[PDB]
């Protein structure tokens, strides 16, 4: 992303000897841990699925994933949350019942 030195175009703006500063420890809030992977997987085996999550694994097996993403978009907020939910339900089905 080095710039050109002229005012328009793709990489518009002044050429500057770049520094690449130190990475902040925020921007790593999304990194899970060794610990919280263990806690969330042990709460998942105690809690189990939800009434809409139990329905989602029926729709995946009996009607495919386009019908389950359409439902999970209605259940959860947005569509990009429905993508991450149906794959997690695909991580449920593929891990347990098959192998």
């Amino acid at each position: 992303t080095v710039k050109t030195g002229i005012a328009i175009g793709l990489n518009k703006g002044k050429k500057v000897t770049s520094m690449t500063p130190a990475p902040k420890i925020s921007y790593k809030k999304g990194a899970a841990s060794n610990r919280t992977k263990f806690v969330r997987s042990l709460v998942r085996e105690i809690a189990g699925l939800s009434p809409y999550e139990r329905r989602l694994i029926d729709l995946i097996r009996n009607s495919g994933e386009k019908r389950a993403r359409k439902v999970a978009k209605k259940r959860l907020g947005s569509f990009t949350r429905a993508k991450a939910k149906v794959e997690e339900m695909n991580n449920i089905i593929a891990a347990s019942r098959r192998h």
Binding site: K3, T4, G5, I6, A7, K12, G13, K14
Partner: protein, 148 residues
């Protein structure tokens, strides 16, 4: 001051410059721009044509710093050289010693070619140049260097 005011000249005379028949009232034709399409139409057309209606597209969150590009004509462009060096650089009109003119630090975004620089070679540090501003600068023996 109120001493020099024509309200000191209507003392004694009844209607204070407002007429006997007219009888200056509070709001005889509305309030403000009231009735521009109905009873003030002959004033709206004829002195304000184009008032009512919609033209063009909206710009949500317009910032007038994106559009900052003040123009400088080829008319001046030597005012950005100081006067003590202006007569020095005007004479000895030659390359290898040519005045670098920082038009952005002078506060301009665009150079335009309105007319007739002297035949001295100059170096113009610009962001945007027109066609004719570049042609006349190069016809004097100079270049324009685009900067950001």
């Amino acid at each position: 001051p109120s001493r020099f005011t024509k309200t000191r000249k209507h003392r004694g005379h009844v209607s204070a410059g407002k007429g006997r028949i007219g009888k200056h009232r509070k709001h005889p034709g509305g309030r403000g721009m009231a009735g521009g399409q109905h009873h003030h139409r002959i004033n709206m057309d004829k002195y304000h044509p184009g008032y009512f209606g919609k033209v063009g597209m909206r710009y949500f969150h317009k910032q007038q710093a994106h559009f900052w590009k003040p123009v400088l004509n080829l008319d001046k462009l030597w005012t950005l050289i100081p006067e003590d060096k202006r007569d020095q650089y005007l004479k000895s009109a030659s390359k290898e010693t040519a005045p670098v003119i920082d038009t952005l630090a002078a506060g301009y975004g665009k150079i335009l070619g309105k007319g007739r620089i002297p035949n001295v070679p100059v170096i113009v540090k610009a962001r945007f140049v027109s066609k004719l501003a570049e042609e006349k600068i190069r016809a004097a023996g100079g270049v324009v260097e685009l900067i950001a």
